[PDB]
Amino acid sequence: MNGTEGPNFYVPFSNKTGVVRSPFEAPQYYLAEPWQFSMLAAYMFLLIMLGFPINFLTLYVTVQHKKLRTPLNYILLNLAVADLFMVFGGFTTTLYTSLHGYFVFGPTGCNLEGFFATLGGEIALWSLVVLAIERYVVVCKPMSNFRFGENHAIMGVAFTWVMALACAAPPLVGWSRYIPEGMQCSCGIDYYTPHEETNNESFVIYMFVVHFIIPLIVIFFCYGQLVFTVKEAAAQQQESATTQKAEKEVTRMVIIMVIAFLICWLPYAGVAFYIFTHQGSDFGPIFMTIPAFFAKTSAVYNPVIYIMMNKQFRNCMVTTLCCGKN
Numbered sequence: 001m002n003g004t005e006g007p008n009f010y011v012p013f014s015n016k017t018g019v020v021r022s023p024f025e026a027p028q029y030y031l032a033e034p035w036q037f038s039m040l041a042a043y044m045f046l047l048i049m050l051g052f053p054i055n056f057l058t059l060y061v062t063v064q065h066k067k068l069r070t071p072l073n074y075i076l077l078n079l080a081v082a083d084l085f086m087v088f089g090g091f092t093t094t095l096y097t098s099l100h101g102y103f104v105f106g107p108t109g110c111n112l113e114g115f116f117a118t119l120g121g122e123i124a125l126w127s128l129v130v131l132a133i134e135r136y137v138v139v140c141k142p143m144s145n146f147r148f149g150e151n152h153a154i155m156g157v158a159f160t161w162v163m164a165l166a167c168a169a170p171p172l173v174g175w176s177r178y179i180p181e182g183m184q185c186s187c188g189i190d191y192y193t194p195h196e197e198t199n200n201e202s203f204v205i206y207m208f209v210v211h212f213i214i215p216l217i218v219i220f221f222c223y224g225q226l227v228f229t230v231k232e233a234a235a236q237q238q239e240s241a242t243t244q245k246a247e248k249e250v251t252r253m254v255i256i257m258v259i260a261f262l263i264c265w266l267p268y269a270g271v272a273f274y275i276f277t278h279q280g281s282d283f284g285p286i287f288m289t290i291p292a293f294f295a296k297t298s299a300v301y302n303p304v305i306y307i308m309m310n311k312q313f314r315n316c317m318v319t320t321l322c323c324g325k326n
Ligand SMILES: *[C@@H]1O[C@H](CO)[C@@H](O[C@@H]2O[C@H](CO)[C@@H](O[C@@H]3O[C@H](CO)[C@@H](O)[C@H](O[C@H]4O[C@H](CO)[C@@H](O)[C@H](O)[C@@H]4O)[C@@H]3O)[C@H](O)[C@H]2NC(C)=O)[C@H](O)[C@H]1NC(C)=O
Pocket: 004, 005, 006, 015, 018, 019, 020, 021, 022
């Protein structure tokens, strides 16, 4: 027996020596050394110090530069906002709790922190999906006489909001639940205890299919077709070096974006799928925080890839940071 059950939690540590306390009431220093809790805090600090400026600057630069405010870019603003939900909902609260050694805000705080942290990263997830769809629609022109504009861009943003709520809300009202995870300082969806009262098994399948496989297929399809269309168009215009450049640049960025998507969610899903097969095993507190490393860090590397590697934004950023010139 490798864990310790309670009303609103599951501490991954045997209580056979009697040392296990609630993650809402007392420090979990039997679960991990105090210095490891400090390193958790150190990492949350890094994610905030990098994550806030990068994502805030994205919104600020867009307000100052008319050229950035195009319908396509609406979703990349949505991304930046989602990343800020991850920072202020997730990382800051985890920084606070990690320094105590347990989730001080209790079960209600666990639901809040879990909701906004889940909502944040899920909006970001679907933002990356909707961008691929919009880019696919715009480049491949799969529809007869269609023009992407403000109305469509806003629907795409609302679509992410809805999908993210379809993921984050149900645990608040019966279907699965939010409980402290890993080192017990941050809360999230329960996918490591078969909890019949909330039906965790169905929700995990629903999550795996609707919120990972479907996104993964849409992203691979949309960008697959986009790279196909661009490559055959360049092959029919090989005299233009500009077009050959643009073709290679687009293919390079698609590979970066697809690989980046996998790094973010494949570890989180690979571990989730493993627990579905091998249930109730001796999963450490650190083991649970390894997938969350890659996922939470996306709040920094997504805006680096999807926004700061754009030459247009990069100029506006320099201008805004240098007060007007340069
Ligand atoms: C992990 O295991 C440990 C060990 O079992 C466990 O901690 C223990 O919890 C029990 C309560 O569940 C504690 O027992 C209490 O001891 C105090 C003595 O001061 C009593 O006052 C408590 O109440 C009794 O007496 C009252 C008298 O008026 C009655 O009103 C009441 O009904 C009770 O009879 C109670 O006996 C025990 O002290 C700890 N032990 C240790 C070592 O901490 C812990 O709960 C487990 N963790 C999890 C998450 O499940």
